[PDB]
């Protein structure tokens, strides 16, 4: 009926007047390409041979356009239509009629998409205004869309089979307004939380940390090699930090050529101890911490995501605020290129020597687990003798499970510290958790020491049978084994009655992500 | 137990406190078998094992094992009056006694997993959402699906050229027939950060293995047409349409049609080219002939002509195409490690070792720590032990007889470092690389999702009829 035809989602108003099928729009898969700027994207040549741009004919481009008419739809950089002042449209595709390829001022040639055009790129859902930014076109051979690595974090992309759209501006006012309003260098900082959206985060962040210690001494050859990759370079080679016995540079002295202008910044690094800044050695810092970038050159301090990532007051933020956007674009580019090209000299990996601890960390891990289990037996034995007084605000069940969860939650952070203080300097888990590119300090504890304790519906694993959890245990059992405390790790493997519980917890954590998106995506429409 | 009156599918539940007895003979229940325990010992003696490895010429099987009273079917309601012992060698001994009155016992506690979760090596080392990711991803790994794939005329079947069985195998892939019809190739993987084209879930892969058949395949799709008589003066016929007789005769190249109106098998067919020539007479004819899709360039495999249920002529054309892996295609491990291909380098550009074994596949280190897939690493160590010793390694879940220190003691004897690491050299400059890169053979799968089936563009094409906006799809 005519009500059902003018009704809601995919009707005539929510489906054909606001959102509609458009043309001049392409869609394929994204893959990385670290040799591109932030400002650019790489289009395959078949998409670029199908889409066009209607370009008028003036006496400043008549020769290049008659060249573009004389080759067309056989050679790629050509055209496919000539449009007259009458509005008449003659085609170059099939039967080109070669007596009528003459151009004149006022006509327009419909050109193919070349290098250097301005487009619009998009990933769905578009949750904010950083998710549709105007890139620039460079044309590359194979068959995916190719974009830079730092532009991943606005779009919330990843390169395991995503697809991203691009819409091509047709008129000249709309290409001018996309150029002067919504280019990707013009959108580095956000108005939402007045910090930048784009930071140096992946493999280049771990290698930015390992490029800026005091150990990194470069010889003359890779100073030549790495200085070949700077577009904002003077032409001068800086005089090294060490002149005898043989010339050696440092990482901070090559990194201080990337940092533009004369900007000033003071930050810290993630392993800056709290009781250092009080007493002596506050302006030396024997662990080489407390980054000071003074008059445009990194004097001291190990860099990490606290100084280059997405925070407020970072080095990319200060360089955006003081110098501009055309210089911050070059800053992101030069960091990623020179640190990748050093990173194939240094190299990086993760094995299982990076995931195992020595034979005296394991012993007191089992000593503190045996301590936790014995104390839980004391509490349960205390409650069965009718001797457990409740607390203000709680029942007897609530004070029981709150203090058992207190004991067990205080005895897996201890094993976590026994794992954290037993790593090494050459380790790679620790070299990822520190640098801030990926990982967290509970993953090191679950991989090495104790997985933890699962819980569905916000409490410890419930009696799904009558008075039991699984049919192996005895009725009304309340110990740590019977109700989900996974005391092994990911490397010592899991027992069956424990892998089942870990599957329950991971199931709940998968349901919540499966459900939440509809409610949030409904609120965000109703506000807007 | 010994089957006098009662068929073995009933369930007999006695709840003592409720003071009642429930007996169910109803259909639809689900159940699983178990081993009876007496006073404290089992009932399955060795007398039942030594005449059970002789099934081919003794006539002794599982039904003589049920009818002897040593296994028994238990369902879910009766699993609340039961007292299981999960393993006999550790839970029915004389120790500090947890329970002393067990009434059943499991066969092996790794029979709680399904079909797609019994193809994961070491599932007790992985984070359980990764097990849930791969339990829905070995359902779209291209392999060999059935042995008579020649006779069958299906739409959209993908067949791999050179499959291989895994080197690190669970002990329950002998029972669901994975070594007869496998899907995937044991590949030399390197977990290392090399150029930057394998960041955020991608893969560098060797081009000089792709040139030797690595993850190459073939793609068959079929086409049906069916002649019919719809009116008194309307009839459809397999005829080659000519220009001045039939009306709608566009840029498609009709000359490859034979006298029968059907393309013979062997000739290659590009885009927009007629494969079946059928026409209908006009109420002096108009054609209704089928095309292919856009930009395939395949070869017709076979053409099959028959008569249907009604009694009209009916044809089926199967068309094949070969698909070489390229830099958009999607590969996956057995541990939820999906990711496309990033770029392909030759063999003179991959990082070699001290005997010249470049990796087939380079994956990033960052995919390991945040999602905690360290079953991947143990099959990449166990794979390196198994390719050198000559066995095929065991990865069944709840062993407690395969440790990382035992695998490391075995790898220490064959001239390698006991934690998998090796010294790679650089391929662009020949210099060494300062860290030691974890190398080893793992089992990757090639998934269904390609980039030639997903690329798409548009500039001024067809529009809909009702609202005159561009089309859908």
């Amino acid at each position: 009926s005519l009500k059902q035809r003018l009704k809601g989602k995919e009707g005539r108003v929510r489906g054909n007047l606001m959102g509609k099928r458009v043309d001049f729009s392409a869609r394929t898969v994204i893959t990385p390409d670290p040799n591109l700027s932030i400002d650019q994207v790489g289009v395959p040549r078949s998409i670029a041979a199908n889409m066009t741009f209607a370009e008028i004919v003036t006496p400043f481009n008549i020769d290049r356009l008659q060249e573009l008419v004389r080759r067309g739809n056989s050679q790629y950089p050509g055209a496919k239509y000539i449009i007259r002042d009458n509005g008449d449209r003659i085609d170059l595709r099939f039967h080109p009629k070669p007596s009528d390829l003459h151009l004149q001022t006022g006509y327009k040639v419909e050109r193919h998409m070349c290098d250097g055009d301005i487009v619009i790129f998009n990933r769905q859902p578009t949750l904010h205004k950083m998710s549709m930014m105007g890139h620039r076109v460079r044309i590359l051979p194979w068959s995916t869309f190719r974009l830079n690595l730092s532009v991943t974090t606005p779009y919330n992309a990843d390169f395991d089979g995503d697809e991203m759209n691009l819409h091509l501006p047709q008129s000249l006012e709309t290409r001018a307004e996309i150029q002067e309003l919504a280019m990707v260098p013009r959108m580095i900082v956000t108005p939402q939380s007045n910090r930048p959206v784009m930071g140096i985060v992946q493999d280049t962040l771990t290698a930015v940390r390992k490029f800026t210690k005091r150990d990194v001494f470069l010889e003359r050859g890779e100073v030549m090699n790495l200085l070949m990759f700077l577009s904002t370079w003077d032409g001068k080679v800086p005089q090294p930090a060490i002149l005898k016995p043989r010339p050696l540079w440092t990482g901070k002295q090559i990194f201080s050529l990337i940092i533009p202008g004369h900007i000033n910044c003071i930050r810290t690094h993630s392993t800056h101890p709290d009781d250092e800044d009080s007493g002596p050695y506050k302006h030396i810092s024997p662990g080489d911490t407390k980054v000071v970038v003074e008059n445009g050159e990194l004097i001291m301090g190990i860099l990490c995501k606290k100084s280059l990532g997405t925070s407020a007051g970072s080095l990319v933020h200060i360089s955006y605020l003081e110098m501009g956007h055309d210089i911050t674009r070059l800053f992101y580019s030069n960091i990623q290129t020179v640190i990748n090209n050093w990173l194939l000299i240094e190299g990086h990996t993760i094995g299982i020597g990076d995931s195992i601890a020595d034979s005296k960390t394991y012993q007191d891990i089992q000593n503190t687990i045996k301590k936790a289990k014995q104390d839980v037996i004391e509490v349960i034995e205390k409650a069965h003798n009718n001797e457990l007084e409740p607390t203000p605000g709680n029942t007897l069940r609530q004070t029981f499970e709150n203090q058992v969860n207190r004991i067990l939650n205080d005895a897996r952070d201890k094993t976590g510290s026994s794992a954290q203080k037993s790593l090494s300097e050459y380790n790679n888990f620790k070299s990822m958790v520190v640098s801030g590119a990926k990982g967290s300090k509970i993953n090191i504890s679950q991989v090495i020491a104790v997985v933890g304790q699962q819980n569905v519906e916000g409490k410890r694993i419930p009696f799904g049978f009558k008075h039991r959890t699984l049919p192996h245990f005895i009725k009304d059992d309340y110990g740590p084994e019977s109700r989900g405390f996974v005391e092994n790790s990911y490397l010592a493997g899991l027992t069956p009655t424990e892998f089942f519980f870990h599957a329950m917890g991971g199931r709940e954590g998968l349901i919540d992500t499966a459900v939440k998106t509809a409610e949030t995506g409904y609120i965000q429409r109703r506000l807007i | 137990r010994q089957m006098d009156i009662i068929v073995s599918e009933v369930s007999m539940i006695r709840d003592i406190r409720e003071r009642e007895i429930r007996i169910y003979t109803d259909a639809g229940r689900i159940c699983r078998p178990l081993l009876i325990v007496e006073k404290q010992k089992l009932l399955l003696k060795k007398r039942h094992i030594d005449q059970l490895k002789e099934r081919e010429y003794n006539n002794y099987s599982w039904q003589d094992l049920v009818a002897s009273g040593v296994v028994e079917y238990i369902d879910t309601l009766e699993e609340e009056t039961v007292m299981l012992a999960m393993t006999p060698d550790d839970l029915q001994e004389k120790e500090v006694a947890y329970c002393s009155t067990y009434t059943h016992c499991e066969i092996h506690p790794s029979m709680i997993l399904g079909v797609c979760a019994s193809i994961i090596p070491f599932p007790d080392h992985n984070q359980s959402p990764r097990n849930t990711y791969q339990s829905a991803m070995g359902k779209q790994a291209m392999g060999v699906y059935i042995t008579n794939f020649h006779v069958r005329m299906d739409t959209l079947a993908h067949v791999l050229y050179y499959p291989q069985k895994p080197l690190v195998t669970t002990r329950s892939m002998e029972y669901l027939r994975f070594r007869e019809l496998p899907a995937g190739i044991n590949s030399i993987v390197a977990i290392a950060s090399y150029t930057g084209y394998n960041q955020e879930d991608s893969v560098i892969m060797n081009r000089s293995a792709v040139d030797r058949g690595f993850f190459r395949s073939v793609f068959y799709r079929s086409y049906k047409e069916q002649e019919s008589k719809k009116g008194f003066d309307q009839e459809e016929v397999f005829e080659k349409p000519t220009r001045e007789t039939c009306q709608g005769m566009r840029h498609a190249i009709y000359d490859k049609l034979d006298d029968d109106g059907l393309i013979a098998p062997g000739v290659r067919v590009s885009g927009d080219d007629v494969i079946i020539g059928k026409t209908v007479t006009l109420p002096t004819k108009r054609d209704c002939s089928t095309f292919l899709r856009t930009s395939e360039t395949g070869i017709v495999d076979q053409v099959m002509v028959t008569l249907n249920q009604e009694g009209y002529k009916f044809c089926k054309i199967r068309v094949r195409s070969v698909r070489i892996p390229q830099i958009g295609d999607k590969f996956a491990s057995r541990h939820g490690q999906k990711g496309t291909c990033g770029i392909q380098y030759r063999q003179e550009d991959m990082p070699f070792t001290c005997e010249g074994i470049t990796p087939d596949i380079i994956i990033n280190p960052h995919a390991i720590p945040s999602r905690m897939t360290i079953g991947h690493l143990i099959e990449c160590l166990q794979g390196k032990v198994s390719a050198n010793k000559g066995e095929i390694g065991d990865a069944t879940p709840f062993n407690d007889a395969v440790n990382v220190q035992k695998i490391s003691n075995l790898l220490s004897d064959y001239g390698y470092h006991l934690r998998g690491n090796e010294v790679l050299y650089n391929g662009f400059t020949g210099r060494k690389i300062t860290s030691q890169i974890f190398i080893g053979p793992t089992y990757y799968q090639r998934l269904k999702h390609m980039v030639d089936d997903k690329i798409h563009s548009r500039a001024r094409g067809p529009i809909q009829i009702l609202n005159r906006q561009p089309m859908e799809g």
């Binding site: 939650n409 509970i442 819980n455 409490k459 991971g506 954590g509 | -």
Partner: peptide, 8 residues
Amino acid sequence: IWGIGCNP
């Protein structure tokens, strides 16, 4: 999968 205060 960690604890009551963490994640499941």
